Symmetry: D2
Subunit: 335 residues, 4 copies
Amino acid sequence: SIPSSQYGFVFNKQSGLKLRNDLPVHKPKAGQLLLKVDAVGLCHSDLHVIYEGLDCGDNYVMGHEIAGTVAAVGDDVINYKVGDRVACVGPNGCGGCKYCRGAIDNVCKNAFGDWFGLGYDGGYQQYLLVTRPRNLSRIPDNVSADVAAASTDAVLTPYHAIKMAQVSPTSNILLIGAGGLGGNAIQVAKAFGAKVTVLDKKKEARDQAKKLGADAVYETLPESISPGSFSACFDFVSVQATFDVCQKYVEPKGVIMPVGLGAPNLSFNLGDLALREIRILGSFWGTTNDLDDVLKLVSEGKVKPVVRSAKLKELPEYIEKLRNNAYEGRVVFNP
Amino acid sequence: IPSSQYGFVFNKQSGLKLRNDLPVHKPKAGQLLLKVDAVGLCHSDLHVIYEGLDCGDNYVMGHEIAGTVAAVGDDVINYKVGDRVACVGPNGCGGCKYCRGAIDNVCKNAFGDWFGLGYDGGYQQYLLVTRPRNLSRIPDNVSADVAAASTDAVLTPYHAIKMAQVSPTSNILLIGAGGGNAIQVAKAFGAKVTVLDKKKEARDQAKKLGADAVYETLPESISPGSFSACFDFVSVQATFDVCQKYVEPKGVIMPVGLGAPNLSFNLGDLALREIRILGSFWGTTNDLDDVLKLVSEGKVKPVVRSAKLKELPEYIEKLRNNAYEGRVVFNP
Amino acid sequence: IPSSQYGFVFNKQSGLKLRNDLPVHKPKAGQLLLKVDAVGLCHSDLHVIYEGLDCGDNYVMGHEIAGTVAAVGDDVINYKVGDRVACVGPNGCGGCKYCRGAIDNVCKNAFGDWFGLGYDGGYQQYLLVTRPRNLSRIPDNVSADVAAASTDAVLTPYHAIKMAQVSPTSNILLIGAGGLGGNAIQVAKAFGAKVTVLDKKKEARDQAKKLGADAVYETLPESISPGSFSACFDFVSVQATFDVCQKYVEPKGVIMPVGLGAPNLSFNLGDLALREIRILGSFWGTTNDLDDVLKLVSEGKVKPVVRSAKLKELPEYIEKLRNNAYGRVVFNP
Amino acid sequence: IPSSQYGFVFNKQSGLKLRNDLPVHKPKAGQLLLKVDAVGLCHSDLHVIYEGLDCGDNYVMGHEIAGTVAAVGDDVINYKVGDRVACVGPNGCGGCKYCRGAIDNVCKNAFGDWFGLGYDGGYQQYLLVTRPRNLSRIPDNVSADVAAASTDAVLTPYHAIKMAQVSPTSNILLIGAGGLGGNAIQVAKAFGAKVTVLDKKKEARDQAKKLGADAVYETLPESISPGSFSACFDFVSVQATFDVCQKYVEPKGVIMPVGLGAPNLSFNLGDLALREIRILGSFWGTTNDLDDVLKLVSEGKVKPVVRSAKLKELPEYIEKLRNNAYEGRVVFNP
Ligand SMILES: OC[C@H](O)c1ccccc1
Ligand SMILES: OC[C@H](O)c1ccccc1
Ligand SMILES: OC[C@H](O)c1ccccc1
Ligand SMILES: OC[C@H](O)c1ccccc1
Ligand SMILES: [Zn+2]
Ligand SMILES: [Zn+2]
Ligand SMILES: [Zn+2]
Ligand SMILES: [Zn+2]
Ligand SMILES: [Zn+2]
Ligand SMILES: [Zn+2]
Ligand SMILES: [Zn+2]
Ligand SMILES: [Zn+2]
């Protein structure tokens, strides 16, 4: 059954992203595993590499939102067996440095340039070689491959940030801008049982937020909202104007989470941040264990990743759409 | 216990002026009167006097206070006359979630009502303490001069170090620490300390204070993103960029200086390497107890100079001109 | 503004007796007089009356208080006549390192001075509050009865669940759910954690499941993998139930012996060390906790179920509780 | 290099035996071959050899390894031939939530596969390290002997002390400064805590004073107020000593039962709950802990006393240790 050749989309600084019908199907070494891709997602991050000069390496199959079934396992591999359904952990940490093993494999220096679909081969192919089974998460039986894949980033990232902020049933948080992880952030936040107030200019966003379970929805925060009264602020747009709002409404000892691509630099009022001991925390993707938590929240139905499916050979057709106007959520491709 | 007293009152107009007819209030129920023995001075005062740092108006300055309880009011059994105590600058209310949440230093109700910074301070003879909870017993082997200095010079950096969770395995960077008990405190936690300061004088001082490595410029070998924590005591865009540059992934940046009113950080870098910027303000009441205990045990030895309170005007000018180094306390 | 009142006072000699000549203390500076609107009852009271539990002597009982500020002595700035508040059991001094360290529930100076357990409580018409810092404003949408019922039934388990750092990804085990933390399940459910209940009484199991429990058992089936729970709350705290916790708690997990069981409990040293298990003691709750608790109730996260009756009927209910489970009954002075 | 080597293999039926025909494994990929420079010995080995402690069967013993990378398999880039590294006992799998959660010392999959305790150890010339993640680089100023002597004697107490969150403002009580309790004083000192030691042995007390202990007692004096210690580390862990901890630990304080005194221990429930005392279990140490340990040793904040000897002398040292004879930490060079 297992072929010796396969098709996939390999990225190259020259020809860009093109289809390859003569790609090899690597046989796993002792300690490695071969994953048969079932669902692979697409998002703006891929656009950065293909058009915004974001260099994550060269000559590698793209697709960082993987979900599939183990096709073959090398000897010594006892934690996984053929048939096991798992989702890939993007950062793909080395698992040996102090960062990995330190519970933060998402900021691994050695894995830099070796992330799934972003430096190292990804899911835009039929069979992916997993050099380090450590960066995988078992997919619950009630969770489909399309959903799982749609959680590897659209849910994992916001989840990581939410947990980093130590949100609880007593948390009073503010979210700036829905859509683009903002939506899934609403669900995740509410999963911790926290009160959620949302701010967004776009019309749809608010209606969507209100639908997702947002306790508060505004196009502009009223005056009845006392400044410095929110325990946590997540800025999904991350622009000076929006960052200023966070610092204004974040309560003393509170936290500001700039999780947007707004501007390259952002300034903060030192006097205020110092006197009220405000804290700015950086957040990137998610950790391996975080993915296990996310898949559990999805399995429990606490987070509903909304996505549509299509065959992988339609990727080019969808990459163009995302470049112009995009849609509302994500689309996973079936190899 | 006279009926009147002298002291220095600050006004956004008249500025800091000597007042020879200030009233001496008697402690009410739950209150206490403090006989100021030593009151310190630092740059924080200059920012309020000349650099427009509104903390209130028409209040006696001096936020570094050390004194002796001259009188107590009924319903006060915690303290008794003769007791030597130091004031907890923040002067929290004690009745909010912050104060009862172990962080009375960020008390909202007390904002702008700090000792010598909104509320009456130590630049006088007698200070009425409306909230004695914001006091710390001064160890017998700790003089008033040292205690007064420790209320800020030691308390602030201590609170920042503990907040950063520094340990004996921490590899930290201090910028402009020589210009100062921060180094001793850090070493008290057993952390490896590297000091970056341009002035040779400050460097020698740091080396003397136990610094493990002092530099005017970080040499090669000290790769970027290698420090677990970076404390900026100058807090200027140039110095902050150094911290973000040399702080390791998931490391912390503590902008503990009175530099620029605003600072910018690279969003991409901070997010990618999960760098965290933590604001730190003065210290809590519990921190002041810890600090005095550390000073008493000699873990931290503040260098203090003394003089009469009526000489304050002179040292103010000398300080703003950078005429002297080290801390100087005053005795009323 | 009566100068006299009635109430139930406890005494190691004559137990809990009704008094109709009790005085109505007038608040001094910093003090405050509270008019009791509702006061709860729980087994904790039985231990002090029928089981030599010494929390002091000669004092009005009732430690689940909820009332309205009737009078405030001078200097009182935070509260004033009309304010609806609930009492914080521990009644910390607010001056020690523990109190101003965010743990006023373990105040040493307050030992034996807890509301209704050392110091006068709520089983009266007017309670004198020596330290008004130990009060929590009652939200507008929360009745006096519900609030009173939250001063212990919800507060205690909340504090423990919060201490265990339970999250929506937690897999906890609760031993005892028949009044023994009936609200614990709801509290845990509020944090989004999965809750498995173990109780020998069918009544408790039906109740547990109705309360939100994801799984209920009279005896954990062998099919349940040992050391698979992140946290275990023992509300009965007997050697047998503790051994269940240590066996099913996962490595680096926590055991919360929050029951009034045996005076002593033993753990297997080799196991605790090897799998790095941790046993955390938990007591009542802090002032900040009560604020969070009352906020959770106000938001609907926790819905305490309580029955009310006149304070005069206290003795009648104390017997009921000594013979069954239906406890969780507020009284109105 | 050699096509064969010698080493001491343990078998439930034959016991610990010298083997001159041991094979030298070739690292597949992601693995490496470690030439053992120094391997320590402690009482833990005796429990396996004579006290029936079952950690597995048919494996080279020696769980305190220090060596040099002799060869690396393909795909191995973090390490290269010549690197000096120490082994992390637990040898976690590195794939479960425990290992990925910063606590590889309690890995379930790895239980029964610890270096020298289930899996092959250091009592040989060349050790095949299956999971390189469980290694800690040895600072250039730290000898192999000292490093090996830190893999347990220092790592274990360090992990426990770190877990209790000791700080420059801590006031701790240490019961039993006989074995690992010795380096425990140096480690606690490194964190800046005040240390009060309680030990019945005279020599132990004298050692405590030398190691910088602030207070050393044969019996705690009446001047010591009950519930005044922020943390209590009990190295003997007997009911009598545990009661001491529960009596002298302050509210919210922590009791660390790091001994083998008894199979069970009881605590006063009322006391524990009312004052919120916490009992924390501690086992060996993590991989990152070893990094910290080697740094503390490298800086000279912890100085483990060690004497070396040829590996083929192990049998004699075992018997002597088995009788308390030499007593002093001893490492062997293959
Ligand atoms: O959470 C990670 C995100 O998908 C991302 C990955 C690579 C580059 C930019 C952004
Ligand atoms: O953190 C203590 C310092 O004295 C200070 C207090 C108020 C304003 C600026 C600086
Ligand atoms: O923690 C609350 C409970 O009412 C209780 C208080 C004191 C003693 C035993 C039990
Ligand atoms: O710190 C661990 C200790 O060496 C030990 C290991 C295995 C068995 C008993 C004790
Ligand atoms: Zn993506
Ligand atoms: Zn790594
Ligand atoms: Zn100052
Ligand atoms: Zn306050
Ligand atoms: Zn009760
Ligand atoms: Zn107290
Ligand atoms: Zn050993
Ligand atoms: Zn593992």
